[PDB]
Design a binder for this molecule. Structure first.
Ligand SMILES: NC(=O)C1=CN([C@@H]2O[C@H](COP(=O)(O)OP(=O)(O)OC[C@H]3O[C@@H](n4cnc5c(N)ncnc54)[C@H](OP(=O)(O)O)[C@@H]3O)[C@@H](O)[C@H]2O)C=CC1
Ligand SMILES: COc1cc(Cc2cnc(N)nc2N)cc(OC)c1OC
Length: 205
C-alpha cells in the first residue's frame, strides 16, 4: 500500500475555484501543455522501464474530451465505488485512493516490464479532499489564475493562506524547474486575457 509520495496538480483562481458545469471555465493552451509535460516526464535513463501514474475521480474522467482519453503515455486509474462496469482497455478502476495504491503495487511489481515513477492526483474536488488528508501527500503543483472567474466547485483546503503557512511552503522557481526537469516560464503568462503563474508548494511528512 505504501512507498512513494503523492503529488497533487491543480489550476485554481485566487478564490480557490476549480471548475463550473463539470468543465474548466478557461481555455488555456499553454496550461494544458504544462500539465502534459509535468505528468509525463520521466528521467531519460529510467525512460525505457518507467511510467507515471495519473489518479482521477470518475466525473473528471467523464469530463476529459473523449479525444484526450485515456491520457497518453501515463498509467490512468479512475477512483469510483460504482466501478460496476468501468470501460477501459487496461485503464484501471479502484474504490479508493489507498485501494488504487495497493492495485498499482500488485500490478506493477518487480515482475512487471513497466515500473512506476511518480504518482499524480489530477482531480476533481472530491478526490482532492481525500488526497489532502492522505499521509503521503507532500507536494502541490499549482497554476494560479489571477481572475475571479465564476466557479461552482472549490479546492478544499486554503493552502496558500496565512492559517496554513507553517505547514505549506512555496518553493523557489529553480527548485520547480529541477523537479519537472525542464525550463518553465518564470512569472506571469497571458493567454486569452487570463494572467497566470506556475508554483510548487511542499510540506514535511
Ligand atoms: N481546475 C483543475 O485543475 C481541475 C478541475 N476539475 C473540475 O472538478 C469538477 C469535478 O469535481 P468533482 O465533482 O468533485 O469530481 P471527481 O472528479 O472527484 O469525481 C467524483 C467521483 O469520483 C469518485 N470518488 C472521488 N473521490 C472518491 C473517494 N475518495 N472515494 C471513492 N470514490 C471517490 C466517486 O465516483 P462514483 O460516484 O462513481 O462512485 C465520486 O462521485 C469539474 O468541474 C472538473 O472540471 C477537475 C480536475 C482538475
Ligand atoms: C488534459 O485536459 C484536462 C486536464 C485536467 C486536469 C488538470 C489540468 N491542469 C492542471 N494544472 N491540473 C490538472 N489537474 C482537467 C480537464 O478538464 C476538467 C482537462 O480537459 C482538458
Amino acid at each position: 500500500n505504501q512507498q512513494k509520495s503523492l503529488t497533487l496538480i491543480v489550476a485554481l483562481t485566487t478564490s480557490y475555484g476549480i471548475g463550473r458545469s463539470n468543465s474548466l471555465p478557461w481555455k488555456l493552451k499553454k496550461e494544458i501543455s504544462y500539465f502534459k509535460r509535468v505528468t509525463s516526464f520521466v528521467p531519460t535513463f529510467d525512460s525505457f522501464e518507467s511510467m507515471n501514474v495519473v489518479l482521477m475521480g470518475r466525473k473528471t474522467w467523464e469530463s476529459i474530451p473523449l479525444q484526450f482519453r485515456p491520457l497518453k503515455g501515463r498509467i490512468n486509474v479512475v477512483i469510483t465505488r460504482n466501478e460496476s462496469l468501468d470501460l477501459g482497455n487496461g485503464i484501471h478502476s479502484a474504490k479508493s485512493l489507498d485501494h488504487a495504491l495497493e492495485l498499482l503495487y500488485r500490478t506493477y511489481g518487480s515482475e512487471s516490464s513497466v515500473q512506476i515513477n511518480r504518482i499524480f492526483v489530477i482531480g476533481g474536488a472530491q478526490l482532492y479532499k481525500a488526497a489532502m488528508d492522505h499521509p503521503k501527500l507532500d507536494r502541490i503543483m499549482a497554476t494560479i489564475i489571477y481572475k475571479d472567474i465564476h466557479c461552482d466547485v472549490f479546492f478544499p483546503l486554503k493552502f496558500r493562506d496565512k492559517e496554513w503557512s507553517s505547514v505549506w511552503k512555496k518553493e523557489k522557481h529553480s527548485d520547480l524547474e529541477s523537479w519537472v526537469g525542464t525550463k518553465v516560464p518564470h512569472g506571469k503568462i497571458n493567454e486569452d486575457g487570463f494572467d497566470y503563474e506556475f508554483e510548487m508548494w511542499t510540506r514535511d511528512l
